[PDB]
């Protein structure tokens, strides 16, 4: 589909918005989800995007379209997890249990449902 580039472009804008939000947060709290780890996770996803673009480029005339979709979906879920972690921290969540619950989600919708549950019942 033509929408592989749009989701990849959308991922980039989301990453940029996360970096800005972190930069502001530091200027005046989880397990595997502290400010330090999030920055490394972001940089790793960016290397992974370039890597898979190079894989697709050389695979032709040398990862099916299904596998590309799965990898884009996995990157989106991870971005969704990172965003929910920043929100939990801003809402006062300090217990690693809730951050680890988020990291067990399979989809962005699961992340959303879990994050909504924690904000509604565990804040």
């Amino acid at each position: 589909t033509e929408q592989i580039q749009k989701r990849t472009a959308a991922i980039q804008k989301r990453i940029a918005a996360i970096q800005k939000r972190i930069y502001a947060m530091t200027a005046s709290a989880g397990a595997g989800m502290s400010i330090e780890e999030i920055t490394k996770q972001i940089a790793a996803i960016q290397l992974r995007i370039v890597g898979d673009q190079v894989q697709i480029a050389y695979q032709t005339a040398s990862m099916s379209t299904e596998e590309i979709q799965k990898q884009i979906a996995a990157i989106e879920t991870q971005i969704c997890k990172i965003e929910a972690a920043i929100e939990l921290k801003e809402a006062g969540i300090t217990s690693d249990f809730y951050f680890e619950l988020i990291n067990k989600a399979k989809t962005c919708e699961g992340v959303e449902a879990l994050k909504e549950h924690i904000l509604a019942a565990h804040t």
Partner: protein
């Protein structure tokens, strides 16, 4: 002994240091394959650094912002790249290409001593973390065959 590691460190170390100093190390080298792999890496790595220069430059600026040895910061990033369970040659060339990009920055700021550790840290991630995958793919011989059709 650990020949796969030894060979990988030689290829990566040569590519990084020649990209940093602009000079080809006239030293002899799994001889033929290492020459074919460093050659494939020169062609492929060249294209990657040009095409994705803005992404690379942006990533490097996010590492400098925290005053630290850039190699230590980068090693911490490379160890999260394959955490989705996927391994392929494109991701592998990108790690080495980004290492070469970083090696040039290290040469600009007069920190060429940290280039050897960089190549070794990248080799540690590829070989000691993806040994089973590399062996199944025929090591550096699968590397040359993937990037060149015959």
């Amino acid at each position: 002994s650990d020949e796969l590691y030894r060979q990988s460190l030689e290829i990566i170390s040569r590519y990084l240091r020649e990209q940093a100093t602009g000079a080809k190390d006239t030293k002899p080298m799994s001889g033929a394959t290492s020459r074919k792999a460093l050659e494939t890496l020169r062609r492929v790595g060249d294209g990657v650094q040009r095409n994705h220069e803005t992404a690379f430059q942006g990533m490097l600026r996010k590492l400098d912002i925290k005053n630290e040895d850039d190699v230590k910061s980068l090693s911490r990033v490379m160890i999260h790249v394959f955490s989705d369970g996927v391994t392929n040659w494109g991701r592998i060339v990108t790690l080495i290409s980004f290492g070469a990009f970083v090696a040039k920055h290290l040469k600009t700021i007069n920190q060429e001593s940290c280039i050897e550790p960089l190549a070794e840290s990248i080799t540690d991630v590829l070989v000691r973390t993806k040994r089973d995958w590399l062996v199944k793919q025929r090591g550096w011989d699968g590397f040359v065959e993937f990037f060149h059709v015959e």
